[PDB]
Design a protein around this nucleic acid. Sequence first.
DNA 1: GGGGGAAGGATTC
DNA 2: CACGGAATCCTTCCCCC
Length: 431
Amino acid sequence: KEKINKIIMEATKGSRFYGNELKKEKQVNQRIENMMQQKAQITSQQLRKAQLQVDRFAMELEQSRNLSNTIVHIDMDAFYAAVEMRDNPELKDKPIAVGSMSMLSTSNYHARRFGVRAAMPGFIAKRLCPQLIIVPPNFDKYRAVSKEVKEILADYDPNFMAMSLDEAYLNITKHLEERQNWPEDKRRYFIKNSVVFGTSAQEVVKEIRFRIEQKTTLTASAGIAPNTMLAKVCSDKNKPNGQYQILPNRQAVMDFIKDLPIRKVSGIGKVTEKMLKALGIITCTELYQQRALLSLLFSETSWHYFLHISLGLGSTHLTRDGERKSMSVERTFSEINKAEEQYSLCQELCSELAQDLQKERLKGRTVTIKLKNVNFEVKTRASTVSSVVSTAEEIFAIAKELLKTEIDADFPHPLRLRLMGVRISSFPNEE
DNA sequence: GGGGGAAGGATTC
DNA sequence: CACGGAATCCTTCCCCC
Ligand SMILES: Nc1ncnc2c1ncn2[C@H]1C[C@H](O)[C@@H](COP(=O)(O)OP(=O)(O)OP(=O)(O)O)O1
Ligand SMILES: [Ca+2]
Ligand SMILES: [Ca+2]
């Protein structure tokens, strides 16, 4: 059934949307032509110099390899899909998918065999699965089912820190310590009879995958590695409802990534993947022995990242206690080109922004407005201030101008918008 | 020269 | 019958000291 693309492509070609992609895709394909050339003109000598620099560095990274923490990553299974299939049985053995007709968020495994995967227009999906059932999301439910899963994690790490509703990291390195010598009374749980769990990190995670099960009906995969970088990759190795671990010794970390696809990493995306295969980089093992050249093509802050993924290095301290940098609200709709109407919705927006921006009492000193053209061309203007602006009023006050500035710049021709947005940032976060 | 800040990308759930 | 919303981090420039 791999000829899905013959329906996917077949129903995107002309699309206002597709057209825009080409440029996004060309522009990038060129950022590459540039990188390839700028490279080809590097002194076969500079590498000797570079190499030394790099190697030297690594040698040290390697010396401070922190293999003492046992990080765990829990990742729910088709979370939004699952939750709904649970609450409304009539679905159960049918092909569903949370989201709308425009964009789909998750999909149960059965609906996936048709091609329905996250981030795929709703209408498109129904072409691969006419018998589909699209359920509109109710974040108020999920947000809540999550907190029941969290309360369970807590009994394992007070500062668990959660990346999202379906993901979360844990440092069971401490709970592990105080468990080795524990009776069997604190390690048995009732079914619905009992089952008792061991002391290995393998079992501790098995107990968590269990406590959750029997308190939601939902299942989730998990990974266990010395650092958070591998944990995220490891949880998916044996999904759904499963897990995988990488022991603490060096070799494990190495033998693991040895032939691991660079993209798989929780940071390498569509661009970095293409952009890197350009130099022939596919696995971390390859990447590692191109450390010289890399060091002279990607800004410093970057090859640092790559060098890490080469050695199998990740973080080992789940910061915790959300700092928060920005905060926003946006929305797409039907072409709104009418002059007046613009400020109009903008009013409503800023309102919501401040509105939501109140529960937590914060105040930033720079507003950002986002205007998305009818042909998916974005543009974002923002202006800084002296204040700490907070009330719905204060905000619009600025946003209206920035918005105006554009209507003029492109004045006697209307601004055919498809989406608009207002993001507030620059919080003092206490000085 | 260096230290933000604005613009627009890349990434993930 | 027409490709989300929200956060955060990164890549380049241009501007004021
Ligand atoms: N663009 C998106 N918007 C909202 N949610 C998304 C988006 N992309 C993915 N997700 C969510 C929906 C699912 O919970 C999940 C699917 O992506 P995936 O990379 O497989 O994560 P996952 O491993 O946690 O989910 P799964 O158990 O389905 O495999 O992430
Ligand atoms: Ca999930
Ligand atoms: Ca995952």
